[PDB]
mmCIF file of N, CA and C in Angstrom:
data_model
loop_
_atom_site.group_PDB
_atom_site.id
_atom_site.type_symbol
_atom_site.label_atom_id
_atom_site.label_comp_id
_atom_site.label_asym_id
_atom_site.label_seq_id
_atom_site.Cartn_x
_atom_site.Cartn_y
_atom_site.Cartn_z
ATOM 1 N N UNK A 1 0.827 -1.226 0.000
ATOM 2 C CA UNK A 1 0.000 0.000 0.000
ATOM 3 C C UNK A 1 0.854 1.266 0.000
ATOM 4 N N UNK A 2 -0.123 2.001 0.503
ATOM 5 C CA UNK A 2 0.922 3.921 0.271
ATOM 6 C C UNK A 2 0.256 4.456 2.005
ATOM 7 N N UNK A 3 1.075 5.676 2.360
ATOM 8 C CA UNK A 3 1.059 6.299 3.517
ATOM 9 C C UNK A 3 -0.252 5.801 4.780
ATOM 10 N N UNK A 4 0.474 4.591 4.853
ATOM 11 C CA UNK A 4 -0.101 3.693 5.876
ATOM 12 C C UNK A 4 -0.101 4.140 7.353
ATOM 13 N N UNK A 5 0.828 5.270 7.640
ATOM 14 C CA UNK A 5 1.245 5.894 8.716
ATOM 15 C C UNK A 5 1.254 7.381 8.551
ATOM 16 N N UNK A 6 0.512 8.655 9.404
ATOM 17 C CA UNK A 6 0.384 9.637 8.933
ATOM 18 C C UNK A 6 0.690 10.690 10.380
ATOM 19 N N UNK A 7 1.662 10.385 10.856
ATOM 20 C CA UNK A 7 2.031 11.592 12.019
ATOM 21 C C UNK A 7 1.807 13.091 11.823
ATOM 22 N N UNK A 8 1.430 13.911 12.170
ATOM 23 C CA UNK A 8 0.999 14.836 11.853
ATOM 24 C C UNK A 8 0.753 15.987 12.838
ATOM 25 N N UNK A 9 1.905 17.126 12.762
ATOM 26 C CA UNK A 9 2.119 18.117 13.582
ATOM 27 C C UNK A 9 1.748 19.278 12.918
ATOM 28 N N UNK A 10 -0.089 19.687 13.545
ATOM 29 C CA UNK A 10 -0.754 20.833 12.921
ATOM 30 C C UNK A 10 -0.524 21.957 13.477
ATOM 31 N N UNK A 11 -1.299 23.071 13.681
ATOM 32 C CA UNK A 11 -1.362 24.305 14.338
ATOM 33 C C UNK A 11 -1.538 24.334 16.036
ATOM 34 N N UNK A 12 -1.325 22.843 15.986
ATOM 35 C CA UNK A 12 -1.718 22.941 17.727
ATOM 36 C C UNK A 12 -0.957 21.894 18.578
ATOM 37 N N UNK A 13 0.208 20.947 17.787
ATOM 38 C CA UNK A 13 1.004 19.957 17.784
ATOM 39 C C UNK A 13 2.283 20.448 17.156
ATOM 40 N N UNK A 14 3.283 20.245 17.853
ATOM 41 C CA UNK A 14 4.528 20.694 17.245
ATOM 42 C C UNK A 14 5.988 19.929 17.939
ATOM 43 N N UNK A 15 6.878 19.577 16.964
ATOM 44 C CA UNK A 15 7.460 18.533 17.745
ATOM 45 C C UNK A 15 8.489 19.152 18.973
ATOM 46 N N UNK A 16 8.477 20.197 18.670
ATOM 47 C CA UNK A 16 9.420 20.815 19.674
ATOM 48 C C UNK A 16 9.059 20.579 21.181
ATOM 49 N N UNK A 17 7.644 21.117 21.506
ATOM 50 C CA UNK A 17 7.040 20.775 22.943
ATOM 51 C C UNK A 17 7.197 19.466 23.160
ATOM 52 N N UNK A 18 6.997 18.210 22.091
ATOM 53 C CA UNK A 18 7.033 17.063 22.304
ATOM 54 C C UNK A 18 8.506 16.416 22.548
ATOM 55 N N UNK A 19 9.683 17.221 21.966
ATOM 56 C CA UNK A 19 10.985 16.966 22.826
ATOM 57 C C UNK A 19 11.153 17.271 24.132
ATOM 58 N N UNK A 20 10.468 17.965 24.693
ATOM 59 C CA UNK A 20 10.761 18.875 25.608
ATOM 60 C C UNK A 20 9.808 18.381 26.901
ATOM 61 N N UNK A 21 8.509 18.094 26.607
ATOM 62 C CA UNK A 21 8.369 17.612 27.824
ATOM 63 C C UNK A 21 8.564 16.157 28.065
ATOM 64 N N UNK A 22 8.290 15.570 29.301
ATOM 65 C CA UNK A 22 8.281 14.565 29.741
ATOM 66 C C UNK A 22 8.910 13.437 29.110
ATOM 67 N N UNK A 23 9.735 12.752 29.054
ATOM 68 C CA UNK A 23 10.847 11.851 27.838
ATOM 69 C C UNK A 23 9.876 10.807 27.535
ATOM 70 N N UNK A 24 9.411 10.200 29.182
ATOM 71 C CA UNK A 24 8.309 9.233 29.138
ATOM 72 C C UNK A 24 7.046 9.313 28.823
ATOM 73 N N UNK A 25 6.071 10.552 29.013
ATOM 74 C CA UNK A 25 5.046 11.043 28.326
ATOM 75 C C UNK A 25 5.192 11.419 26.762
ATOM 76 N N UNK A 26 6.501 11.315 25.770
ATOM 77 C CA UNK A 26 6.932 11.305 24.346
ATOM 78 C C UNK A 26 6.958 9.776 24.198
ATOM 79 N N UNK A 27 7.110 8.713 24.634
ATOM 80 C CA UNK A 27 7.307 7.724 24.230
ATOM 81 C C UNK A 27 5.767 7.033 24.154
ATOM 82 N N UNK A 28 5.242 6.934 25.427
ATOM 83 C CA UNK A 28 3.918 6.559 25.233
ATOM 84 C C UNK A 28 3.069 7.375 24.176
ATOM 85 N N UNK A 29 3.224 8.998 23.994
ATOM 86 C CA UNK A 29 2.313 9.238 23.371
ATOM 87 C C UNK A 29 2.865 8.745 21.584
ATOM 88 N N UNK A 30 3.844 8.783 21.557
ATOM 89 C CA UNK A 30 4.136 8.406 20.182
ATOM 90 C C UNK A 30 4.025 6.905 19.878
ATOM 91 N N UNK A 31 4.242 5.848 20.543
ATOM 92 C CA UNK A 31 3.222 4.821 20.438
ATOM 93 C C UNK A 31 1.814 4.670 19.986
ATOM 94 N N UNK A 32 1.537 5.810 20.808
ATOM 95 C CA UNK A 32 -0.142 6.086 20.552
ATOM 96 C C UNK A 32 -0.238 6.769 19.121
ATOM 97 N N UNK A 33 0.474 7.490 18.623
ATOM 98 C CA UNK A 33 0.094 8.889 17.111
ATOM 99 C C UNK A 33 0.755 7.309 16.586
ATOM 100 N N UNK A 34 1.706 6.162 16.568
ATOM 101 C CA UNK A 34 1.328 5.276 15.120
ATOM 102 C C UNK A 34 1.312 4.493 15.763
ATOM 103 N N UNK A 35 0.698 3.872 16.450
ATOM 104 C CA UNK A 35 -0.464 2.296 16.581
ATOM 105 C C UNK A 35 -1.828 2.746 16.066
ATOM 106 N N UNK A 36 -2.146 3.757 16.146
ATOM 107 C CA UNK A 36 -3.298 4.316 15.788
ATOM 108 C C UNK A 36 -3.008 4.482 13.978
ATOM 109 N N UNK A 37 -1.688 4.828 13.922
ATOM 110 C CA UNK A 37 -1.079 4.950 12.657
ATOM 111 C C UNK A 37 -1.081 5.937 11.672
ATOM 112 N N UNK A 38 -2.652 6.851 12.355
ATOM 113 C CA UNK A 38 -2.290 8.250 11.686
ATOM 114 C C UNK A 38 -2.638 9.230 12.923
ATOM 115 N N UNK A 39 -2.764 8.988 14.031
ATOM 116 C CA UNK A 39 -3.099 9.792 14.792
ATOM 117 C C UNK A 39 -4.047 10.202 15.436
ATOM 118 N N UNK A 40 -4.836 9.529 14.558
ATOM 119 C CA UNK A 40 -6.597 10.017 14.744
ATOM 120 C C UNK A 40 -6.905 11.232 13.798
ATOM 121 N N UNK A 41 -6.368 12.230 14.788
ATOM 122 C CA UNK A 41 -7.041 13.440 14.577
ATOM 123 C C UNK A 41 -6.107 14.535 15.772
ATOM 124 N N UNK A 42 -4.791 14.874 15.847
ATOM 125 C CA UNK A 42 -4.298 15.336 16.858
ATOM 126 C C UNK A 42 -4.191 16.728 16.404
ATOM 127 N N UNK A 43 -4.630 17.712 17.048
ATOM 128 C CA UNK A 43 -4.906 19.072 16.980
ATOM 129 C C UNK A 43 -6.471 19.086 17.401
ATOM 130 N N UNK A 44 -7.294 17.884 16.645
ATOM 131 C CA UNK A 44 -8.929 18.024 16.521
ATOM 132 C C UNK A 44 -9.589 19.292 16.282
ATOM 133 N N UNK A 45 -8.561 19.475 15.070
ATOM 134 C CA UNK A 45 -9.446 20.679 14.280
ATOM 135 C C UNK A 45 -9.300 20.374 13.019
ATOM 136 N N UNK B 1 -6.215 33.460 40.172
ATOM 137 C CA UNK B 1 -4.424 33.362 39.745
ATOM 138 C C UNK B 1 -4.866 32.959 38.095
ATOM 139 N N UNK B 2 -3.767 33.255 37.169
ATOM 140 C CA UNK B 2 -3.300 32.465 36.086
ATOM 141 C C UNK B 2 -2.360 31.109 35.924
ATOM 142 N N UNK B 3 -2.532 30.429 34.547
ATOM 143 C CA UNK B 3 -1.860 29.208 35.018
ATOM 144 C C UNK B 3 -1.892 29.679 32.905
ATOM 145 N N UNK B 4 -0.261 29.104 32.387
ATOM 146 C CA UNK B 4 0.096 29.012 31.389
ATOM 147 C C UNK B 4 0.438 27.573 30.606
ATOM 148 N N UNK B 5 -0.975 27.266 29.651
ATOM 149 C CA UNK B 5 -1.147 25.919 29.076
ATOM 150 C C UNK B 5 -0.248 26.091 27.881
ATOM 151 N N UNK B 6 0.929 25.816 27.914
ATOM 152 C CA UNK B 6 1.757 25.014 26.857
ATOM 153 C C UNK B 6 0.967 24.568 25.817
ATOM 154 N N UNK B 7 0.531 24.742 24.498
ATOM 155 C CA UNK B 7 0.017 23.594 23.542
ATOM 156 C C UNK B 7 1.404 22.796 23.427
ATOM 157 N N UNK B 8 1.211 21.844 22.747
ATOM 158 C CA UNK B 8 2.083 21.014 22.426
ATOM 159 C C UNK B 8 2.625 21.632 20.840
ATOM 160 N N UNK B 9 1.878 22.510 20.298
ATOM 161 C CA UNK B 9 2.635 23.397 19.280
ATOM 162 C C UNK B 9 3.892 24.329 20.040
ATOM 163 N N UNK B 10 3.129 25.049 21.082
ATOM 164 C CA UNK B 10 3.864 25.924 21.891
ATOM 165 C C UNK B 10 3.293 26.772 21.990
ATOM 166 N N UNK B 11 2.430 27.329 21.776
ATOM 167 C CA UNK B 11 1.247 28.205 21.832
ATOM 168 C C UNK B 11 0.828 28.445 23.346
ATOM 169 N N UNK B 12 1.270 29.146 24.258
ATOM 170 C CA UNK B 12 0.812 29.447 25.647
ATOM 171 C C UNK B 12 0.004 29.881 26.114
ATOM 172 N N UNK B 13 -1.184 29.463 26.016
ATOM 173 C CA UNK B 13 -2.415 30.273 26.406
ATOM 174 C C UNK B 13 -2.674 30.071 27.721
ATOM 175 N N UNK B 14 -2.582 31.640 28.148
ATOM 176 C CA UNK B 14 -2.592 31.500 29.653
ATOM 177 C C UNK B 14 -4.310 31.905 30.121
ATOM 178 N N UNK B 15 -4.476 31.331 31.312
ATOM 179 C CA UNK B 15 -5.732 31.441 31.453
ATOM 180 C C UNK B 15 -6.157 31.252 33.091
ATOM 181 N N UNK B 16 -6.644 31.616 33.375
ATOM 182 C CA UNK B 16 -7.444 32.359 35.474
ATOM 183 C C UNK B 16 -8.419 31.296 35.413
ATOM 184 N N UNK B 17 -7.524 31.321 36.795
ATOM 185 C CA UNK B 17 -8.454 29.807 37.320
ATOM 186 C C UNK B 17 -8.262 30.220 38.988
ATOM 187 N N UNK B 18 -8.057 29.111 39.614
ATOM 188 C CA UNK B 18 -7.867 28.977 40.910
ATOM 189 C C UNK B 18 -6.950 27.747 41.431
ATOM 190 N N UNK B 19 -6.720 27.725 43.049
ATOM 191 C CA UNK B 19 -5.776 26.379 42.853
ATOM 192 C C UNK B 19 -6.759 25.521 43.230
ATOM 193 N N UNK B 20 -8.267 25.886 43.598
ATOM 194 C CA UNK B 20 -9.132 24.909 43.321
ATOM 195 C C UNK B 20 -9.771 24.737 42.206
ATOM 196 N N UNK B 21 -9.751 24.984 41.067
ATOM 197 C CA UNK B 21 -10.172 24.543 40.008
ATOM 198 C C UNK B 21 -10.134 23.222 39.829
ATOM 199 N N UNK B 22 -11.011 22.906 39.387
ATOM 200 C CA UNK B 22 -10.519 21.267 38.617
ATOM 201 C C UNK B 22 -10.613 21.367 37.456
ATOM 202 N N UNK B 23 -9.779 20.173 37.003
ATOM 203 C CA UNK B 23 -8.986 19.589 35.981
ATOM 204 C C UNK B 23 -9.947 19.841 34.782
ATOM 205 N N UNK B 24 -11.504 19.103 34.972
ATOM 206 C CA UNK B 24 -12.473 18.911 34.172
ATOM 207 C C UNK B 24 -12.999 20.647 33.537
ATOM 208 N N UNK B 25 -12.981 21.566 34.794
ATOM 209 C CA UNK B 25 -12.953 22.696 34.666
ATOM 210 C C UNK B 25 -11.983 23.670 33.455
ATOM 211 N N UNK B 26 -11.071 23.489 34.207
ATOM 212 C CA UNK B 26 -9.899 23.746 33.271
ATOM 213 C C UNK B 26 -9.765 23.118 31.632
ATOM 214 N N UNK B 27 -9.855 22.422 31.994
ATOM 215 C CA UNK B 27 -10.000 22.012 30.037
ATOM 216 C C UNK B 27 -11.245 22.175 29.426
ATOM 217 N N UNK B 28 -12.168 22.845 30.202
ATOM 218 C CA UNK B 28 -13.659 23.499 29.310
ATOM 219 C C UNK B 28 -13.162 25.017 29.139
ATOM 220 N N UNK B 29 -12.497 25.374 30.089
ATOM 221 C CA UNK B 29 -11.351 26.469 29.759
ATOM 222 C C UNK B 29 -10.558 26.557 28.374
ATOM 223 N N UNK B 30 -9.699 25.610 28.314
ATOM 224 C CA UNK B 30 -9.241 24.912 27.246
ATOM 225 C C UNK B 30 -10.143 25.298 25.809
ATOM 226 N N UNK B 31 -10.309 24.355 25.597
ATOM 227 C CA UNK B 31 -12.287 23.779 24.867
ATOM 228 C C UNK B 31 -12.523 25.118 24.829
ATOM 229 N N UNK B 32 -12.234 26.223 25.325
ATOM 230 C CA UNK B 32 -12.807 28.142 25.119
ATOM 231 C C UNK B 32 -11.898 28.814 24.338
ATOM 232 N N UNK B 33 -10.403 28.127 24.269
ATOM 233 C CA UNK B 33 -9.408 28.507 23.610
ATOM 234 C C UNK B 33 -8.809 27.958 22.710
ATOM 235 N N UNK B 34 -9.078 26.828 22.559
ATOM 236 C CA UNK B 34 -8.282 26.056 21.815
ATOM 237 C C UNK B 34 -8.733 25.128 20.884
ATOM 238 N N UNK B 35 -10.513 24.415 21.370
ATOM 239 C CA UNK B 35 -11.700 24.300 20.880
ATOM 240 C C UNK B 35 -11.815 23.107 20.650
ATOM 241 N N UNK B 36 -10.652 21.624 21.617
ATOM 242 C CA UNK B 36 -11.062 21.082 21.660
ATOM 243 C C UNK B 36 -11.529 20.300 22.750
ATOM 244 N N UNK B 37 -12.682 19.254 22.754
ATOM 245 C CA UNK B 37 -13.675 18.828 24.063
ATOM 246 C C UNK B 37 -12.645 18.535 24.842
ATOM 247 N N UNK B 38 -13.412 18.684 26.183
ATOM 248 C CA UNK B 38 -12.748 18.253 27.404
ATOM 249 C C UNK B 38 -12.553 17.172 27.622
ATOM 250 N N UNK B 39 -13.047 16.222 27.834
ATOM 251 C CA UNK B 39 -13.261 14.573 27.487
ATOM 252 C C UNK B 39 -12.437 14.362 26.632
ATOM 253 N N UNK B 40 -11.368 15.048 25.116
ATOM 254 C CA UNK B 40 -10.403 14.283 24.463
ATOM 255 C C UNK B 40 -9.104 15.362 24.449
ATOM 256 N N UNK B 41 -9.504 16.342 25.819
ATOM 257 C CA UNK B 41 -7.313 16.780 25.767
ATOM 258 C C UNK B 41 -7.169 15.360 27.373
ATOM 259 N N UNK B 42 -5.747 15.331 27.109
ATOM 260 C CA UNK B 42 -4.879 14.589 28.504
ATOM 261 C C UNK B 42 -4.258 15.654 28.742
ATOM 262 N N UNK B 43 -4.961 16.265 30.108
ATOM 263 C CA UNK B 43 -3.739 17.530 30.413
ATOM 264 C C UNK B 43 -2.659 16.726 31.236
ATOM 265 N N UNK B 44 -1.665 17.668 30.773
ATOM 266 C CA UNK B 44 -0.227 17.140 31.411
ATOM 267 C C UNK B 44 0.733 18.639 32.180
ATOM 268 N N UNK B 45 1.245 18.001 33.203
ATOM 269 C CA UNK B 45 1.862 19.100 33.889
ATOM 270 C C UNK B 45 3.332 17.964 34.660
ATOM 271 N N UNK B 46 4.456 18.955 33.786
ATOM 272 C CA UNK B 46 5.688 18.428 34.768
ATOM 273 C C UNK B 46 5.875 16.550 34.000
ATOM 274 N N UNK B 47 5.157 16.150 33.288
ATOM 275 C CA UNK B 47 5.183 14.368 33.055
ATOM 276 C C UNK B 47 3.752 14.099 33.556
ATOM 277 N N UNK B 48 3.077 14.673 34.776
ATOM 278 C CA UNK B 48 2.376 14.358 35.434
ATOM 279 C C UNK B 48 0.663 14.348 34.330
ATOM 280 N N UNK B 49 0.401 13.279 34.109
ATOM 281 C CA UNK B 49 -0.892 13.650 33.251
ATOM 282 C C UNK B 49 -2.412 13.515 34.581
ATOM 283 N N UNK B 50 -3.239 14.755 34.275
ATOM 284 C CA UNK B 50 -3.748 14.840 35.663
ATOM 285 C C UNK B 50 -5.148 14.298 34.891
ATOM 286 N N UNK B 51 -6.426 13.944 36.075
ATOM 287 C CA UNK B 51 -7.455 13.638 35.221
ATOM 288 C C UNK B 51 -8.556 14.710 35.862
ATOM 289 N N UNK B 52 -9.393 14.411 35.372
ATOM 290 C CA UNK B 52 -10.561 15.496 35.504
ATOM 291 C C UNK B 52 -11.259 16.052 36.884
ATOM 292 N N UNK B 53 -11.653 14.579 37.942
ATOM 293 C CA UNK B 53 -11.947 14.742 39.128
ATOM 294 C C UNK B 53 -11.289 15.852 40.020
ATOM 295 N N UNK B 54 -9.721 16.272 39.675
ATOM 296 C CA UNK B 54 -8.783 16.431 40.836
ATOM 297 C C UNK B 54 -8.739 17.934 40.540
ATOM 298 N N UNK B 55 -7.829 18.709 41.159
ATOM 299 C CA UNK B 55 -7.618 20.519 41.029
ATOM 300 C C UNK B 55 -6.103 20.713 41.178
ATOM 301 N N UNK B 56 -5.956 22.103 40.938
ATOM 302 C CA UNK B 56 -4.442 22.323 40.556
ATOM 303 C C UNK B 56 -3.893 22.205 41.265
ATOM 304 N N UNK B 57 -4.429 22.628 42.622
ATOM 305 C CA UNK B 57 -3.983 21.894 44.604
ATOM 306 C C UNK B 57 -3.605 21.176 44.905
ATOM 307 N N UNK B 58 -4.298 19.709 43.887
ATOM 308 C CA UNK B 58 -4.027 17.970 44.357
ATOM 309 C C UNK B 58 -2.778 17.867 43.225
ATOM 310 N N UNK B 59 -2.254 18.740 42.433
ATOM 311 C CA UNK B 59 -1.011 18.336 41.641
ATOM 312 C C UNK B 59 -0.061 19.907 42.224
ATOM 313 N N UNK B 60 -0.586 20.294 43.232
ATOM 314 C CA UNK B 60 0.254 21.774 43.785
ATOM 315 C C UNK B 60 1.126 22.520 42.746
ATOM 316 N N UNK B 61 0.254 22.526 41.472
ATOM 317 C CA UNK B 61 -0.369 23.792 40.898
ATOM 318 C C UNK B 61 -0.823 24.969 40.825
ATOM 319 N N UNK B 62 0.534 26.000 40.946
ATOM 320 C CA UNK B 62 -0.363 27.019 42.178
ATOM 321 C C UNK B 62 0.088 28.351 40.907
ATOM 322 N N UNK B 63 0.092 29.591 40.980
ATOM 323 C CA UNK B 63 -0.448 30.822 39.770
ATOM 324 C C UNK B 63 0.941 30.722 39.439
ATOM 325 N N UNK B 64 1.084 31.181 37.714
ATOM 326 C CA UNK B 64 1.865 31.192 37.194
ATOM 327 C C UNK B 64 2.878 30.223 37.060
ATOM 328 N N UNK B 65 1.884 29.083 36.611
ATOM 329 C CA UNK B 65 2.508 27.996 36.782
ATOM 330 C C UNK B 65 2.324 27.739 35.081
ATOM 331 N N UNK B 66 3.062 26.328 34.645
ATOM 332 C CA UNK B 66 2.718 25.804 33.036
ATOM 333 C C UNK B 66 1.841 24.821 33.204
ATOM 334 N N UNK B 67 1.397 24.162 32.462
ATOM 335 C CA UNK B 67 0.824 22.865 31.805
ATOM 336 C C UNK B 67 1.282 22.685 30.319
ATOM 337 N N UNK B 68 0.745 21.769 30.017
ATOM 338 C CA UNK B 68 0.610 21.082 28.755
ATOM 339 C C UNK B 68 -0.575 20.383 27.971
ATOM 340 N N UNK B 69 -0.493 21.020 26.929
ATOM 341 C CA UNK B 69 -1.986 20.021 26.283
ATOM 342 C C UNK B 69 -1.225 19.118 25.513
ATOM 343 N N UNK B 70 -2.009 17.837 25.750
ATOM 344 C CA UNK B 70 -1.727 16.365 25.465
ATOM 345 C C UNK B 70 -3.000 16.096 24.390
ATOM 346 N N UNK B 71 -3.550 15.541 23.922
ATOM 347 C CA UNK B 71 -4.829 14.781 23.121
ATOM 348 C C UNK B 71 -4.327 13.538 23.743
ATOM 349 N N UNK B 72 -6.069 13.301 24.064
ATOM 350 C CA UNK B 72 -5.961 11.924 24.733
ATOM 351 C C UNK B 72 -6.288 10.363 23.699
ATOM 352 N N UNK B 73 -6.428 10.516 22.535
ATOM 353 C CA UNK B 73 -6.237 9.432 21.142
ATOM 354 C C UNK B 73 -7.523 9.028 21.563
ATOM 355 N N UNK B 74 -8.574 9.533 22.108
ATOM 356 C CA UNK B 74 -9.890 8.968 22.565
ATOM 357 C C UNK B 74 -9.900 7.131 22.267
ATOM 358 N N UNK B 75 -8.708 6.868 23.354
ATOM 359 C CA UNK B 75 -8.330 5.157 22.664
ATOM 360 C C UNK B 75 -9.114 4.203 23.119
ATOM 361 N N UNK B 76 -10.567 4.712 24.009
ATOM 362 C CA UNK B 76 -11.122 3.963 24.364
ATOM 363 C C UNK B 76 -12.192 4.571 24.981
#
């Protein structure tokens, strides 16, 4: 297939905060943005 | 007091509350600024992801403090 995985840092997600906080709250949540595999919907706008 | 929510873009929207506010409170706060439901941010403060029942008191959260908005992947 094609873009089976779709991470996605909108107007309200940005990877910088996501270096920055919590090392262990980045690992679980990025588990979560691809097991889900596109994210859902992260910004939810 | 004020308390300064980090988006996870970086976007700091600071916003008056109390150190009794709760959590559930605060992210309808949120949900006023940022526009999304309360029920799908995970607020996070410090690593600490807090849940709705509790107030900024029970995570000693006190003015001019940060948070963080998390999305909670509504994974269940």
């Amino acid at each position: 297939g094609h873009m089976d995985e779709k991470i996605t840092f909108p107007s309200d997600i940005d990877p910088q905060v996501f270096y920055e906080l919590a090392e262990a709250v980045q690992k679980e949540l990025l588990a979560e943005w691809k097991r889900t595999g596109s994210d859902f919907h992260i910004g939810h706008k | 007091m004020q308390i300064f929510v980090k988006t996870l873009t970086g976007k700091t929207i600071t916003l008056e509350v109390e150190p009794s506010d709760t959590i559930e409170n605060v992210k309808a706060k949120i949900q006023d600024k940022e526009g999304i439901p309360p029920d799908q941010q995970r607020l996070i403060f410090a690593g600490k992801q807090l849940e709705d029942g509790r107030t900024l008191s029970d995570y000693n959260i006190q003015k001019e403090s940060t948070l963080h908005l998390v999305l909670r992947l509504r994974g269940g």
